[model samples]
Target: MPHAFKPGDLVFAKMKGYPHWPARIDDIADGAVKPPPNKYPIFFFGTHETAFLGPKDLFPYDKSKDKYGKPNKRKGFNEGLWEIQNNPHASYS
Candidate 1:
């Protein structure tokens, strides 16, 4: 996807499987400045169902199966789990 959103622009995004629910784009990062040693661009999303924040364009869409081929429940980030690093802009310092 192209960069079509600004910092305050209102955008909508649908999770891979949760297509029925659309989330509003609460924040955006255009890489204007380099983050600290090991920081990345944080994108905040405020959804009606729940709110979450993570690195821009780093959220995983595919859900990996477990050893028994069972759908993993820990596929995505936990609810209310903030401080997720999806965009690895810097290395470990």
Candidate 2:
């Protein structure tokens, strides 16, 4: 089964097809998967290039896409978030 995350819970997400692109989890949605009529549960994440709004508006950075404009294959991990906790190595303090 896929891991579930909560709002404000730091997480690491691997964008589809983008193995090297790393992202931070910003927000999570409550209830069902649907995100209203026109809106979606926004997950604000930061990457090396710039901040991304994922699982809704923005797509994860993918090398393949850069070459062919294909969609990226990505995944998310909450444990990765824990690793950033109170650590000096963390980009976000």
Candidate 3:
């Protein structure tokens, strides 16, 4: 269960390609970052913003790539998700 994650049901409103987010998640990071007072770690960088990162490499966003899950007919700007699996190598192919 090392790679086990909890994928919650995302509720997408009237969102287009970059829907539901004030800004879209532009890329996947090495792991996650826990800032000064934040209790949890955060991933996914947005457009034109950069943070001092961790040791591993990140997977960048592929514009031509449709990496989303199957779309639900009940659209309301949902389907937005997060990364619970921080270490890719923790369970690799």
TM-score of 2: 0.26
| Top candidate, metric lDDT | 2
lDDT of 3 by residue, 7-89 (tens): 22111112234432211222234684433431112222122222322212222223211444334343321322222122212
On a 0 to 100 scale, what is the lDDT of residue 55 in model 2? 47
Model 2 agreement with the true structure over 1-93: per-residue lDDT tens digits: 434433343333334544433333443336645545433243322222334434443333332234323223433222322333334134442
lDDT of 1: 0.29
- The count of backbone overlaps in candidate 3 is 9
Query: Residue 8's C-alpha lDDT in candidate 3?
Result: 24
Order of all candidates by TM-score, from best down to worst?
Answer: 2, 1, 3
Candidate closest to the true structure, highest TM-score: 2
What residue pairs clash in candidate 2, if any at all? 15-73, 15-74, 16-72, 16-73, 16-74, 17-73
Would you list the C-alpha lDDT of every candidate in the order shown?
0.29, 0.36, 0.25
| Model 3 error, position 55 (Å) | 6.4
Better lDDT candidate (1, 2): 2
Model 1: pairs clashing at backbone N, Cα or C within 3 Å: none
